[PDB]
Each structure stands twice: as structure tokens, then as C-alpha cells.
Amino acid sequence: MLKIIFFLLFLIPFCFINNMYWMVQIMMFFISFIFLLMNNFMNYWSEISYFLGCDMLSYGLILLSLWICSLMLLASEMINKHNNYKNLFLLNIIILLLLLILTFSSMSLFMFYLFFESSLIPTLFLILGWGYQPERLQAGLYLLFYTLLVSLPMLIGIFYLMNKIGSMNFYLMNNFMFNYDLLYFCLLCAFLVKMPMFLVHLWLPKAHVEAPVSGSMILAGIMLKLGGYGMLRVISFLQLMNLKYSFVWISISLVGGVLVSLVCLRQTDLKALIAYSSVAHMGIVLSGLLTMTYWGLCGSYTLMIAHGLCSSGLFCLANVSYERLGSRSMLINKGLLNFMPSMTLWWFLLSSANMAAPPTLNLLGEIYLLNSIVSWSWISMILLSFLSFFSAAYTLYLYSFSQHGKLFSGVYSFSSGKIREYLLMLLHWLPLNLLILKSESFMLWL
Amino acid sequence: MFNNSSKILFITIMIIGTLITVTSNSWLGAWMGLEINLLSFIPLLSDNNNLMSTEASLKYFLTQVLASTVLLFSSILLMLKNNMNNEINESFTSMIIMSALLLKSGAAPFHFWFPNMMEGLTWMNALMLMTWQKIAPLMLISYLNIKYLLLISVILSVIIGAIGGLNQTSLRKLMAFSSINHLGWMLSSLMISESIWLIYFFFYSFLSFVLTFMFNIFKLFHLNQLFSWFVNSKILKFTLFMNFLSLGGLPPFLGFLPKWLVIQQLTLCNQYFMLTLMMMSTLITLFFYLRICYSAFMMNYFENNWIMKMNMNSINYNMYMIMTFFSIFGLFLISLFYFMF
Amino acid sequence: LRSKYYDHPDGEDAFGKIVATNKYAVSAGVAWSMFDVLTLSKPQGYLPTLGRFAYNTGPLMGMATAFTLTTLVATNARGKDDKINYLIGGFAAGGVFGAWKHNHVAGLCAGLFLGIAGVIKKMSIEQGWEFFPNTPIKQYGGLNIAGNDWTIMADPPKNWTTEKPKE
Amino acid sequence: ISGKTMRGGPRVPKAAPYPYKTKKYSVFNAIFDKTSKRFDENSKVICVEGPIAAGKSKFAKELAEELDMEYYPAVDLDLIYINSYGYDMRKLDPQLPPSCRSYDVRNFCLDPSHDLAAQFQIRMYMLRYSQYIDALQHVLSTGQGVVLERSPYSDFVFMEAMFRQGYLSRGARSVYNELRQNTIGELLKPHLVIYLDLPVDAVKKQIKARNVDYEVQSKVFSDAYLSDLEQLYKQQYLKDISTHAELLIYDWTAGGETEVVVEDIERIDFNQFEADIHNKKMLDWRFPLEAEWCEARIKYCHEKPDLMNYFNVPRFDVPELVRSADDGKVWRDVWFNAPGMKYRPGYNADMGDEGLLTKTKIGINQGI
Amino acid sequence: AAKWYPDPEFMKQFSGPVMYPDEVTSLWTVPPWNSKVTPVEKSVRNLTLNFGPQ
Amino acid sequence: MIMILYWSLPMILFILGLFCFVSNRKHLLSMLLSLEFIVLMLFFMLFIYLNMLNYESYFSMMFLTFSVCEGALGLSILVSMIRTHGNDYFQSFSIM
Amino acid sequence: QIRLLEDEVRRKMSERNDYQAYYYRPSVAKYHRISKEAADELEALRGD
């Protein structure tokens, strides 16, 4: 595992040498290939190195980050085009990636938290540094302060577990089952925030709408998963307490998913709409996760991988349109099929994946969470039908409205799509399908 | 120690005064050291070029005189009834001693004088007040073992220290309210141990030692001046301000390690409720630190243009850059430190 | 006059409980009231100064009494001393807060702030843990606390022997 | 005060001058080296001012030669637009955005109404301020007096005159006063000030004698503008400084002889004012104890960076002086990548400096 | 597209002597930026004696 | 009680000293006047306690030395007050 | 096993302060018997 870490560390100096922007991604893509060869993992931890291991769960999430963090560099070519502190920008991602790799590769719960939040600050610099609109302040704080407010109490819950278990290592924790009501709320309300839950999602539409394209990728790509990944490790020893209060979370997320889907239909901003679509699906992920069944756990792991690639993908396309039309509102963006017809194909495939269209990896995960939820209670069929219905209602509205109609009138002349953009879109979607072939690996982490 | 040979003396006599207090095996001996310390600070603090400075020399004097006076009052009373420097079972007479010491250090309920005297101090004066003057008072409180009185000061310290600081724009006055909060953490760390407190104090002084220099080297006294401040490399200015985050105790930086060890011990001692109020209130403290970072994290500003150049002192800056480097990368050296185990 | 709130079961000794809670109502009222009349309001004359003492303390007594009565009334009416009782109690004091502040919303929302506050207190009583417990570990030194001594004066001879006494 | 004829020979320093250009003088240096031991009758400061183009420079050089005084040439924007290696920054202006384009006296005389005028006037005040402090370091460390052409005290006249003609706005004048107030109080006022009262008509004739290209072609040097300066020197500056410094007024010593002027100065006595402690005349330079001498020496020798950091007064409601963020990024790129601006002076290898691997030293009271 | 940067109007927030001015605080003014308040020279009233004639 | 028959009077006197040190009088000197009033009472108690010891009254000199220095220092600060504000009135100081 | 024991051991030390490791405050009586020495020394000198 140290092979990855020391590779990244020695790539830090590449931020300082000039005319090395493009030589960075290749080193970032090549390491993904090298990491892609060392899959021999199992449910239990493997490749121990001083505190760094990796199981099938951590592997897929790590590999997802390397892929996504590599696409960030492709997407944010404008930073290179205007030399807008590109060297500092590169160092932000290389640091950020290292924090993620450690976070998932950490074997002890305290470490996971140590790099859990620490990744936030590199993200926070990203929003303020390279965001256009003035609201990146008022969205910079929300991201920082919702997270800190609920992560600091989690730190107490972590330490209280040493004095009982005597250690942080995940395997040793699973041997215990705790009965204290507050402790349950000090290790899940901290992750329920970052999922996010419907009622505490108020930061998500602000952070995503204002953050740059690259920040949108990682915020939607890996930050929403750290909440999901964290839960998968800490419901193991909260099984008893999970049964007394699960019905509160399931109802909120399920009803939260439906209500947000209606909110999606009344949006008029591409960035906002995609961001609210994240809350909709993340409600199903959390819902199935708390069902605790074998299906709900394997499925939740799957959907987190698939959704991140998609929602990250859809943020590419919004940036492409915004870069030229200059406005992210739906009213400006119309009939793009008649300006950039080649682009509209990628709009569809990424859009179709978001609505659980086949043969994507997204449908495999969504079939499963749906199974666990139904088994949990037949009453869940009511909204789970509504949520899947409306989860396509806004996706069509997102795609159709922005691509189909007659062209805008005031738009000034702008460049057409470039090869970089097409290559970026392929790398987002094409794995999202081929992964179905080897779901063997990225599914059975239990 | 900036102007004349005389300033050199007053600094040393301050060290001797503090040492006499914390090395004294009786209340009366301890009280003497406070008097030595009192007159060592005032001449350092009084300068007649400023109408404000002499006012600062006053508020401190009246407060400290009253504190030592009431401190001696109770100490005489304490050993009038027990006939020992120590009280077998803590009672009201020991509470009175605690009240004076808190006022001597400007804890929450009696902090009012402390920010209100920070208007008219040079930065180097504030550092002596913020860090060193809090040694002798807080170190004697370790002897007294009242919980509720000490506990109340912590709860009010973090609250008043934070909420008050949101409204300020003067950095000297802002740091005062920031220092009141860190004071709250000490007293919390003081009811559990001292070795944590000794560790936590050293880190607190370290960070304040850094932030004071950056303002002192570039003579900044107001928030607006930060935006108007000129630096060659906006990357450099961006990195210097990343010390505030450490002062906010964010884990990627060195400044969290102190906060971290204070939680691993408070939690070990079952003081869960306290940590909730403290750590939660630290966010508000973390807030106005970010308001300073508005001048760095955004990194293209509208700035006045009659300056192209930075004029800075070498030795202070030379020592400041070294201290800043650890303030950002000091975490991986926790392996070396062996004072927590 | 010195009654403790939890000296008896929840649905008991009403006069004992009201005294216990009003005790903390008055103390907090005066404590804040002292700051109010000197630092913030600064009334003039010996009579209006009492109004600030009454204004800040009076309704704060009404809150504590309301919580005890509603909590006590709920404990008997429902037939069980459970968390909803204290939740039911909190909304009463919140209602008094609005009447104090003449504000419909302030009373309602503050009841929830007070409502969840009471719930957690009942949680503590029923599960067997404390909010400000006496510290079990109190450290008075480092590892070498008995070794690190720097004094110069020669310590004259001893007068006690760890050895068993001779006779 | 004592010319070469009076001493009959060159100045004889009381003790060896302290190498203030190369060694710092902090508190711990002050213990072993004292300041008062080097002060003579000639340890004074002289400001040789006058109207525009009154031959001050020629008069100062001759004057400073007789009194064995150090002569400090008047500041000019070449000190900002020419780096140490000699490269001309102005050549970079085609790249820079219009607001950041270089601005000089030539430009002022040719487009006086341009918004960069407010900038240009503050720079002159800042330049004089730094130069003035440099003179004090020379005085306090060497004991030899200094001769200045125009002190920062007299600089507000040009800003005020420009304001009356309407070149500046209300905001720019408001900004200038705050800088001057924020900074001027920290200097030591000159012992002696000499003025060369050329009548307004004479200076207008005199300017055409230089036959400088831009000046003759310009419109700024009007009767109104040149008249405003005369009213400002005599009514505001000279009336104020005379409360502290001895004041001599001549029609034109530049057209006159200096040997008569030196003999006029030596007649002036500088001790009669010493008797009363609180006497305003030459109050600034009255140090009772040796500590006070060293404190002043430390301030200017060792704390000048502080003195030059007071010019940071944030004022953005004024639109002229504000530099847009987009320009700043572009300007930073061009300005600091020019030959010799990559690093501090004396380290730019591409400009020929050598031995950087084994080089660790930096200059004192040097930039950066 | 147009990129927002911290402008003069944004920073007017920090211009005063306090973030949230009210009637009492808005009346004030920012202290001198160099933080030195030069004392103001005031009157000089000297006692007088009719020394003599008695 | 013992404390009431022997140590009550000095303590009651001490608190009256403090209430002088805080009351609103125009001149700063009113603080200095009440300052050594309190010191006079501190001496009185300290002298009660030192005499419970047979021979330890020598420490009275130690206390008096610090009494004058705080008064002497308190008087110096007043002098520095005058030569920046021109007067010592409390209401003349910036309220902060 | 070692950090659940070591933690347990520390509690016993703190409960009774019966070891000179962390939870023990050295109370030195050295100075008083220095004073007693000095008193004895001065007892001999008395006289003229």
C-alpha cells in the first residue's frame, strides 16, 4: 500500500516545476493503472503497512478517488489556460488525494477521523480560490461549519470507545455491541450530515452551485461517500441501538427523497438541479444502509461508486455549457442539441445512468437497496415507488429541457466542443458500464 | 527588550517575579512574587507617545492591585482557620482565593478589564500579557481544588470569549477575546492534570508567539489593513495566514495537537458534557479567524497601488518563518514528543 | 428549605420539587440581573433598580415552577415517569417564555430548546451517568515528579525511617 | 556651521563613523557604541528648498562642499522604475494594463489630468520620506551633517497646488493627508531650512532656460499653478517650520554666490536656543541623556522598516488609487518576472550574480 | 465568464470600528492607524502674585 | 464563634476598604487614598496571624516594603497620567 | 489488553495516591528542619 503513498508524495514537487500541468495527470493516471493491478483483497484487511491496509470495501473507494481526482485535472483545463495559480491548484489536489487515500486505507477508527475531516480544508481552499460567483464565501462557510459542528462531537464518541474496547482497529471493535443512546447519535448524526440527510442538506446545494468544476467533482464524488463509507464501518457495533431509531432515519430519507425530487422539478439552475439530485439518490443509499441486511449493505457500497461517477459526470457537462453560454440557468441553456449535437449524446448517457437506466452499474446497486428496503417493511413500497418515478421526472426535465427546444436568442458566438471534453465524458461513463462485468469485485465486500 | 538597556532589565525581573511565585511553598511567598511581577510589567507597558498606552497602564494597575490585595486577604484568612498553607476540605475561604486568581488572569466573569486594556498596547506588549502573565495566576490555581467555581469560569470563558470576538475589527482587541477562549481550555485542562496544561500552554504560547510577530513585523492593527497589505507572492501571503487555522485547532496543522490531547484526557475523565459546550463554542472562535483569512484565501484583491515593495525586519521575520513552518507541518513530529505518555 | 429535586420518585413531594427548582431560578436570575443593572440597562433610582431584579428573576421563577407542575402533573396523569413527561414539561416553560417576551414564536421555539434539554436530563437519571462527575483520574505530576528537584540547599538529616521500628 | 575657512581645514571627525550601511545597530549594539561622542557643530540637517527650477541642486552641491556636509540628490521616479541592475522597468509598460502603465514627471507635464497623477504625488512623498530617513541614519551614525533639496515636510505643497488646479479630486487629497498624518510625526525636523524666493515671473523665464523638452511643451507650469506654489511655501510650510528650524530667505542663491551664503549661515547661532529646555526651536534634537540619543539612532538605523510600513492605510472608497484585482495579477506577472526582479537584489543569477550556492548574506535596511 | 473578486463594496463591511454598528458604536471612529495618539497641547494657567508693595 | 469575636472586625473593615476602591469619585487620587486604607487593614490582620506565632512578626517589614512600592508605583502612573491627558479625572478616560 | 490494564492501574493510583509516579505530590519538610537547625545554631550564639 505504501507504493501508492510514496508515489504521490514524490509527485508533489511537480507542482513547482513549470509547464508540468499535463505531466501531472499522466502520473496520476498511471498510478491508477498500477493500483488497478494490485487487486487481491478480501473482506478482512490485507497488505498491512504500519497502519495502512485495504479490503474490498476500501479498495473500490480508493480506486474511485484516483479515477475522479485524475479527471479533475482534465476538467479544469481552464486553470492551465489562464495560469491562474495552477501550481498552487495542483498542490491542492495532490494533497487532497493523499488525505483521501489515507482515509480509506486507514485501519483504525481514529485515523479514519483524522483524515476524514482533514481532507476538508484542501476542499475549502479549492472553493474560495477558484470559484467565480461572490457566494463562494457564504457557501464556503456552510461546507466548513456544518461538517465541523457535527464532526467535533464525533471525536468525543471515538475516544469514549478506547476506554471500553481499548483500541481503534475496526476488527476489534466489531466484537462489542453498545447500548448507550447518545453514543449512537455521536457516530451517525456526524455521518448523516455528510450523506446528506434531507433535513440537514442545506449546505449541499450551496457548496455545489458555487464551487468550481473541479470542486464540484470531488464534493459530489468523494465527500458524499466519506459519510457513506464511515457508516459502513460503525453500524457493525451499533446494531442493537440501530434498531430503536432506524425507523426515524428511514422515514426521513425516504420522504426526504420524494420531497427533494419535487424540489428538483421546480429548479431552474443546472448546478442546483444536479446537486439536489445527489440528495435524492443518497437518500436511498442511506435508507438501504440502515436496513443492515446483506443486500442493503452490498447494494449501498455499489451505488456509492456508481453515483459518484455519474454525478461527477453530470457536473462536467454543466461546466461545459456554462463555460460558453456563460450562465448556468436553464432558461439560457436550451436546444444545445442544435449547437453541440455531438455533446448531446454524452448528456443522455450520463443522464440515463442517473435515472437507473441499464446496463449501468447504477441499476445493479439500486435493485438491491430497493430489495432491502422492501424486505424491511412492505409500507416502504409507497414512496419507494414515488421516488423512483420522480427520480426520472427531473432527469428528463434536466436533459430534455436543456437539449431539445429552440436555441436561445441572445447567445453570442462561442467555440464548439473540444476533444478534451469528449475524452473527459467517455472516462466518466464508459467505466460506469464495463464495471458491471466485474461487479464480482466491487460488490461483495461482505 | 526593544529600545534601551532598561527594557532589558524589566523583562528579566518579570522572569524572576514569575519564578518566585511558582516556586514558593506558601501563599505568602507566592503573593510576594506577584508584587515583583507587577512593577516589572508596568514600565514596559507605559509609553507617553500614546494617550492610549497610559490608560492601559492604569486599568492593569488598578485590577492587579485589587487582585493581589484580595488574594492576600484570603490567604491570611485561610491560615487563620486552618493554620496551614493547605485546607483539608475546600470551602468558601478557598473559593475567595480562586476568585482573585481568575481576576488576576482575566477569566470569563472578571475578564472585562482584559480586552478593554488591549487598545493601547504594542504587539510585543500584548504577547507578554497574553502568554507570560497568565503563567503565575493559572499555575497557582492548580493548588486549589474547587470544581464548580472553576467549572463555571470555563463555561463562561469559552462563551464570552467567542461571542464577544465576532463584533471586533481591531486585531489587538480581537486576539484578546481569542485569548480568553484559549484560557477557558486551560482551566478545563487544569481540573484534570497539569502536564496537559503545561503542554497545552506551551502550544498556545507558540501559536500566539507566531501571530503576534506577523502583525508586529508588518504593523497591522485593523482588518482593513490586511486587505491593503502588500505581498510579492500571493502564495506567500496565502500560506502565512494558514497559521490562523492552526490557532483554530484544525487537525491537518500543528495547532490541533494541543486541543487533541486535552480531549483525550477530558474524555478519559468522563467530563463529556463540558467538552460539548467547549468544542462547540470553539467553532464561533474558529469563525472570526476565517474572517481574517478572507484577506488570504481569496487571492486576487482590489488593493491600493502606491506600494510595490515589502519592507520587513530580517531577524524577526527570519525567526517568524521558522516558527510558521512548524505551525503548518508540525503534526508529523508528534512521534518525537514523549511528554504525553 | 433545602430540598433536592430527585430526592423522591418523579411523581412525589410537589412542595419539595418546587423549592428545589425555584432555588436555581432565583440564583440564575440574580446572577444575570447583577450584570443587567450595572453593565447593560443601568437604571437610575433605588426603585427602578428593583424592577430589573424583578423583571429578570420573576418570570424565570415562573418557568421553573411551570416545569415542575407540568412534569409532576404529567407523571401522574399518564401513569408512568418517562421521557415524554420532561418533554411535556419543557413546553410549559417555553410558553411562559413567550408571555414574558410578548412573542408567540419565541415561546414556541424556546420550548423545544427547553424540551429537548429536559429529555436529556431524564436520560441521565434513568441510565445512571452524571453531567459533571468528580474526576476519577487527577494527575499531579509527570513520570519523574518525585525525581525532578533542582534545589541547592543541603537537606539536613532525616527523622523518620521506612524500616520497621526497633524497640 | 564652521566652514573650511573657520576650521582652516577639512572636518575632523570626533570618532570613526559607524559603518551604518553594512552593520545593524540594535539595542545590543548600542551598549558598546555610543552616539553622542560623534556630534560636532556641523552635525545638523539642512533643507535647500525653493520654487520649481531655481537651481537648488547646483547651490546644494556647492554648499554641501563648503560645510563638509553630505549632499543627497533629490528623489525622482527613476528610483522606482530603474532596478539595481540598471534595467528600465518602463520598457515593460506595453504589456501592462493601462491603469498600471508607468507614470513619471514627463507624463505629469504632458497629461496632468490622468488619474495616475494622484498615484504619482504619493510616490514622491514616499520617496522623500525614505530618503529623509536615510539622511538621519547618516547624521546619527557618522556625525556629519546632511544637505537635502526637498524634505517630505515640504512635499504636501505640490499635492495642494495640484488640487487647486483640479488635477486631483477630493478623495485623493483626503487620502494624501491621512498618509502624511500617519507618517510625518515620526521624523526629526531639520535644524536649518534655506529658501530661494524667485518671483513668479522669474521662474517662468527660468524654466525656458533649461530647455527641457516636455516642460516647455507642457501647459502645467502656468501662472496660476506656479503662483499657487509660492502662496503655499510661504504661508503654510515656511510659517510652520520656522517654529522649529532656522529660516534664511534669498531671492536666488542659485543665481547668487554661495560663499556669501555660507558666511551667512555661520553667523546664525544654534546654541542660544539650547538654554530653555522646552523652547520649540530645535526641540526635536534635544536629547537629555545618552539613552535618548541611542533610541533615536536605533529607530532610524534599525526600525526604518517599521517607519515605511505605516504607509499601509486602507482606503478603497477612492476609485483613482484602487488597482483592480484583474490588473494586479497581470501586473504582478510582468513586474516580478523582469530581468533582475525574480529575486532580491544581489541574487538574480541570470543577471550575472555568482556564488549563490555559498552566498547567504542580505543587505541591512535592504528590501525584501 | 466574469469572475467576482473582493471589491471595495465587499470590504466596506470591515471599514468601521466594529462589524455590526449600532447607534452607540456607529458614532465612533477608527483609531489612528499607526496606533499612536499624540497628546494635544493645552492651555497654561499660571498663578499670579502681587508681590509688594507691602 | 472564635472568628466572630476576634477576626470579624478586621474583615468587615477590609470590605469597606474595597467598597471605597470601587465607588465613583472624580479624581484618580481617590483610588490611591483608599488603596493604602486597605493596606492598613491588611497589615492589621496579617499582624494578628503573625502573632499567633511566637516570633515571626519580622515579616511585617516584608509586607510594608511591597505596600509602599505599589503606592509609589501607583503614584508614578498618576504622574504619567497627567502628562498625556492633562488631568486625572476618571470621566476623562476613554470608556473602553 | 495492555491499554485496558494500564488504564485500570492508573485509576487505582489516583484513587489512593499511594505511589510516586504521577498521582503523588512531593510534600517536602526539608526547609522547616533547616529552620530548626538555624534556630539551634542561633541558640548557642546567644550571650555576651
Ligand SMILES: Nc1nc2c(ncn2[C@H]2C[C@H](O)[C@@H](COP(=O)(O)OP(=O)(O)OP(=O)(O)O)O2)c(=O)[nH]1
Ligand atoms: N507633481 C509634482 N512635481 C514635482 C515635485 N517635486 C518636483 N517636481 C517636478 C516639478 C517640475 O516638473 C520639476 C522641477 O524639478 P526641480 O525643481 O526639482 O529642479 P531640479 O531638482 O532638477 O534642479 P534645480 O531645481 O534647478 O536645482 O519636478 C512634486 O512634489 N510633485
